Each structure stands twice: as C-alpha cells, then as structure tokens.
Symmetry: D2
C-alpha cells in the first residue's frame, strides 16, 4: 500500500544513524556523502513525483469516465485532439519519473560497491587479528605462569626473595608485551565492531531504496503505456487507458 | 597507542552518538539512550579521574618502595611501622574511589542489560504479529482468487455488486501488505538499535573488567603492606619487593597509553 | 543449470540433514525436526510430481494451440466449443493438484514459523536467566572480597571457622560460573538451530512463491480459454495467442533446468 | 567450574552439525576433517588427562597433609627421597598435558586460518551477485513492462492482435533472460547461506576449543610449579605445594 512513504521514512532514519558514525574508512565516507545527497535531493523529488502522478491520474480518470459516458457523433477530430492533450500533459511527468529512476539506480549501485569494499576491509582486519591473538594467547599463558610463580615464592618467606627479584624483571616485560598486544587486538576489534554496525545500517538503507526504485519503475512503466477508426474503437481504448490510470492511483497511493 | 580504559571510553563515546540517532522507539529504548547519555556525560569523566589518581598514587609508592629497597642497613621496626601507616592512609581513598566507580558502572550496565531484554521481548511479539497478519494475507489472497474464479465463471446486476466487494478486498490485501511492511520496518530499526546497545555494553564490560582488575591489584597490594605492620624484620624486604610488583601492575593496567 | 523449484528442493534437502544434527533441544525444536523430516520425505516428491505434470500438460497444450493458430481458414464454432471443453477438462486436475501442493506447503511452513517464534521466546528467557545469575555472581564476588578484606584484617578459632565459610563461597562463585557457561552453551545451540530453521523457511518461501506463480498462470490461462467458449468467432485467434503466452510462461517457470 | 566437561560436550555437538554439511569448498572440507580428528582423538586424551591429574592431585594432597602432621627427626634423607618420588610421578602427566596443549593449539590455528579463507570466498560471492542482480533488476522491470503491455493489447480486441504476436516473441526472450539470471543469483545466495551457517558452527567450535585450551594451559602451569635445610623449610615448602595441588583439583574439577 503506502510503500513509497514507508520506504522514505525508513531511509531518513537509516541516513541519520549513518551520519552519526566517525573515524571510518573512505568507503564508508563515500556512503555517508551519497546517502546525504539521496535524502536531501532524491527523496523530495520522489514526493513531488508522487503528488504530480496522483494529481494527473485523478484528472484523467475523471475525463475518461466522462468520455465513456458521452453520446453524439463519433468525432475523430475530438479523439486525436484529446489524446494529443494527454500525451502533452503526461510528457514531463514521464521525464521526471525516468530521471528519478536513473539517478536512484545510479546512487544505489555506488552504495552497493562501497559496501562490498567495506566487507573486504572487514575480513582483512579479521586476518590481522588472527596473527596477533596467537602471540597474545602465548603471552597470557606465560603471564599466568609468572603470577603463580610469584605467589609460590611469597609463601617461601626469605628463601623466595632471590626468586622473587629475578621474577619481577620478567613479569614487567611480559605485562608490557601483553599490554601492547591486547591494546592492538582491542583497537582492531573496535574497528570491526563499528564497521559491522555501519554496514547493518547501509544494508538496511540499500534494501529500502531498492523497494522505492521497484515502485518507481512500476509507476514509470504504467506511464509509458498511457504516453505511447470505428465507434467501438474508442470505447475499448478509453476503457484500456482507464484501467492504467486506476492502477497508477493504486501503485502511487498515499 | 591508547590503552584499554582509554579505548573503551572512546568506543563508548562514539557508540553513544549513534544510539542517540534512533527515534520513534519504545520506552525501554529511551531508557538506554538517557542511561548511556549519563554514563558518557558523568561516569566516564569519573573513570578518567580515578585513572589519573591511581597513576599518581602508583608513581609515588613506586618511588617510595624503591628507596626502601635501596637501603642496605637493617630496618628500624618503628619507621617501618610508621611508613606502613602512611601507605595504608594513602591506599585508602584510592581503594574506595575505585570501588565507587566499579559499583556505579555495574548498576548502569545492569540497567542496559534489563532494558535490552525487555526490548528483545517486544521484538519477539513483533514477529508473532507479522506471522498473524501474514496469515490474514495468505488468506485474503485466497478470497481474492475465488472471487476472480467465480467471476471468470460469469447478468449485469451481479457485477455492479461484485465489483464493490472485489475493490473492498484488494483494499484489504493492500492494507495488510502495508501493515506487514510497517512492522518489518520497526523490527529492522529495533535490531539495528539492539546491535548498538550490545556493542556499547561489550565496551562497558571491558571497562568494568579493567576497573575490577585494578581494584583487585590494590587489594593484593594492601595485603603486602599489612604483612609488614604485623611483623625477623628483614621480612620487610620480601613484602616490599612484592608490593612493588603490584604497584607496577597498576601502572601497566591503568596507563593512558598501552606499551 | 538447476531452476528455482529444483534449487529450493535441493537446498531444503541439505538444510534438513543439518537440522536433524542438533540434539538436546526443546519440544518446539523437535517439532521443526519432524515437520522438516516429513516435508522432505513426502511434500517435496509431490512438488516434483506436480512439476513434471505441469510441464507435460504445458507441452501438449503448446502444441495444440500452435496447430489451432496455423489454421488459415475461419473457425467452426462447434469444434472451437469442443476443443475448449477438452482443454478445460485437461486444465482442471492440474489446477487442483497445484492448489493442493500450495496449501500443504503453506500449512507446514506456517508451523515452522510458529515453532520458531516459540523458540525465540525461550531464548529471551534464557537471557533473562543469565542476567540474574550474572548478578548473583557480580554479588558473590563482593562476598568473596570483603571475606578476604576481613581476613587480611586478621585468634585461631576464628579462622578454623572462616576457612569453612570461605570455601563454601568459592564453591558458590564456581558453581555460578558453571551455570552461566551452561546456559550460554544452550543459547549458542539455539541460535545455531534457529539460523538453520530460518534458512530452511527462506528456501521454502521461495518454493511457495514459485508454486503460487504457477497457480496464478494456470488461472490466467483458464481465463483465456473461457473467453473462447463464451464467444465474431475470429476472437479465438486473440485468446489463443494469449493462452499460448501463458503456456510458455509455465514452461519457463516450472522447468527442471533454468535457461 | 565444570568448564572442561562443558567445553567437550559443546564441541561434540558443533562437530556433529559441521559433518552434516556437503558440497562446500575445500577450506570447509579441511575444517570437517580436522574437527573430526579433534573429537575422535584430542578430546578423549583431555578426558584421560583430567582423570590422571585428579587422581595424582588427590594422592599427593593426602601425602602433603600427612607430612605437615608428622613429628620426629628432620630427615633430609626423607625430603629429597620424597620429592624425587613426586617429580617422577608428575613427569609423564606434565608430558601428556604439554602434548595436549601443543596439539590443540595446532589444530585450532588451522580452523582459524580455514575460517578466514572461507570468509574471503564469502565476500567474493557477494561481489559476483552485485553484478548479476544489476542485470536481473533491469530484466525484471522490462518483463513487468511487457506483462502490462500484454493486458493492454488483450483489452483492444483484434486491433491488439498484431501487437500481441510481436510482443510474445520478446516476452519469451526476456522471461528466459530473467530465468537464467534469477537462477544464477539464487545458486550463489544458496552458497552464501550454507557457508554463513557453516562458519557459525565452526566459530562456535573454535570458541569452545579456545576455552578448553585456556584451562589446559592453566593446569599445565600449575603442574610445572610442582614439577620444578632448616626444619621450618619443609613446613613452608609442603604448605606451598599443598596450595598448588588444591588449585589443581579446582582447575581440573569434574
């Protein structure tokens, strides 16, 4: 039903949470910029398109029902002079629609490409962790060993003082190795975390944008049909065009 | 170069701005937004303060202990007793500030967990609801079919009347389509918002764990110092050597920049 | 090369073997396992059968219609009437078998959804429970601290008795640690099992949608044929040309191998 | 508490669901093989280790309490002749433990590496979809346009017959283009789906295996300590060793 309106609203919310991230790679920054432009420029034009499409279709719908009801002389002078009006009225709305479609598809494609790039970076950060975690795990088992050595020696009174002094050097060096490795592993885990949340949002935005483009393409196709004898010619024609305006009010409904 | 405390703080600062970005959510979500707002605005400066105060205390005691150890003569058990009293007095405010910071963090993170669960419960009920509608629609498309089968079956006063039913039913199919997409929208927002809240808590749990390890270290250190007061007064060498390890443990664990 | 029906069937066959691999789960999970077992064992061969029967019927009507269209003379409205009666008779069993297959699929997939929700509800309650224990442990480690602070405070008949408390409390810390890890284990199993069930349903939803589109096409086709019976008997050319498009729509939609 | 037992059980379940997958890339097959070997060979040895560690520690725990209780002449002849027993008893258990540790770490590392490779393939399948989906989307909008053209023409009676025949060629070609593109996109989506579920399982197995290795390293360290005068020497020593056997019964508890 109100799929345009719902898609728009959901796109606005996703955009707001997309702008809220900082310190991300360039591929993310590209999406933040493009998404900015989509919401400030394309979504207003979709709203505009919607109104104009509904206004146009309601007015032609009346006029087609009027023409089905008329009587008097079949007047080929009237049909071509009517049709020409409809092709003229329709022309700029067909343009607005196609333009919207092309620019929307163009923008979505770039988000798709930047998302794939962003996932590539994601898996490569995962690979950097594997190497360092390995080191860390080892440093941590050594540290556990030293911390237990320490409590042992403390139990031995003064006999454990020589052990304890020698031990204290090593503990210091292993605590600093652990500190530095855990520090680096945590920084990278942070990046992955921020990025995965960021891609959640841009995937949600892209899916919504995809529903909007599908509706826009559908509206565009119906318009192409409208935009493109004997008495019971016109009946069948006007009857056929009426069907198309009616699906237009459904397809572009508020 | 930023250490664990400092990365957690900074990660919690970024995640909060993202949590504030979500609108139109249930009360349980708003509870997390304000809670997170107060953590960042008030609790994290406290942690910064505690961290500076722990490092300052560690640097002083480090120095004092090494000068105790550079002593070659025997140890006067009265100066010993007095130094131990001084240290226990300097330990005390720092022990208790760290305990306050740990409690305030646990309580606020415990409320994020609770509100998080309450939100998951809501989310499940949103899926129970989509299922129902989905069936009302599975089933309104059956009504739409047979109402076309029974027309593709077939005077003119049965289709003046059938038309008015048919439209009313497409208006039900569409309406239901709308409703499912609405609810899906809300589910997607909630799942996004819950991913961020979970992330904030993972960061906050790293911070809690670091603050707790610091508390523990102070306690071990307290234990080393006390084992001088009680007490062959050359036992002092051993408990000072051990205390000095705890003091340096502090410096590593609480440092503003890792190694 | 495998088409949509055939990929869905094969994906549903692999996912079922993986769903059967999980043990020690709640009743709601066992309900999905048996349901999925019966889908694969019984409903998917039905779909295979329907698919073969639709293609066979499509190939025959394709031929019959093209030979109607290769006719250059006018059309005898009695042969027309009889051919339409023949086709409506051959349409009928194929329409209804497709409707049966669609219903049996909806009902069984609807029960996977319901059991899925019931399982998510359980999972939420498992998180409410970890939270509680986590607090009982947050809080038993406080008891463990002060019971060490009050010992690092301190004759011998207070520590013969304190020892017996302390151990009893470590036995509570450990026990709780055990309990949290237990429950986490179960959560992880459920989340794994729910990922597979969701995957099975996504596949099953692709199949439902394809079967439904086929049903719809038959219906459009029925509509084209009927519009000959009713009825300038050269209108036959138009409705035969249209029927022939639906017939080929079938062949593409139901084909064992895509294009 | 029972972290060994719980880790083992959870590893057995993950392994069973890991073997249940088929038609996966080589990187998955490697994990299926290694995980097979871990559960049939390493996990039994961990169970064995556990028993022997608990049996050893209970017996030394008794003997240390007995020695703390004894009276009579300080007998250096007895301590070194006691200790030597303990170092001899302990020796093979220290070996079993270290061996277990080394082989476990070795196996986990390979799962980690195969997981990273598997994610790489995952993102590259995602990239293949983007290109084809683009084509598909376009074919589908064309098809929608043709399906609406068809209903239009059918409404025009025989005037729409010429249109309808020409249209039917194009519909056929566009349905076959859609069929083929949707077919290929669905196959790849299937692969990603199976793989993501497969990586869920191997990530769960790897995390459990990581908890087991940490416990095993802890048990190993405590053993190293045990494995490595005046009267109130022995008191302090035996008192120190008792502390270590006690944490061994805790660390390796059933």
């Amino acid at each position: 039903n109100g799929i345009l309106s719902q898609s728009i609203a959901n796109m606005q919310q996703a955009e707001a949470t997309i702008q809220s991230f900082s310190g991300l790679p360039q591929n993310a920054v590209n999406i933040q910029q493009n998404v900015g432009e989509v919401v400030a420029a394309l979504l207003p034009q979709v709203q505009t398109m919607q109104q104009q499409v509904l206004a146009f279709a309601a007015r032609l719908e009346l006029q087609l029902t009027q023409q089905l009801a008329n009587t008097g002389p079949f007047n080929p002078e009237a049909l071509k002079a009517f049709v020409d009006l409809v092709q003229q009225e329709i022309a700029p709305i067909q343009t607005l629609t196609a333009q919207t479609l092309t620019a929307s598809q163009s923008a979505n494609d770039r988000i798709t490409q930047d998302n794939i790039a962003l996932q590539r970076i994601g898996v490569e950060l995962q690979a950097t962790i594997a190497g360092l975690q390995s080191n860390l795990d080892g440093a941590r088992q050594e540290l556990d060993s030293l911390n237990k050595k320490k409590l042992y020696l403390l139990g031995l009174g003064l006999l454990g003082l020589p052990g304890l002094i020698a031990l204290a050097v090593t503990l210091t060096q292993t605590q600093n190795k652990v500190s530095s490795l855990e520090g680096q592993v945590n920084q990278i885990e942070g990046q992955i975390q921020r990025q995965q949340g960021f891609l959640g949002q841009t995937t949600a935005f892209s899916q919504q944008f995809g529903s909007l483009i599908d509706r826009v393409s559908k509206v565009g196709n119906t318009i192409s049909l409208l935009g493109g004898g004997d008495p019971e010619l016109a009946r069948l024609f006007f009857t056929a065009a009426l069907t198309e305006v009616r699906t237009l009010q459904v397809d572009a409904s508020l």
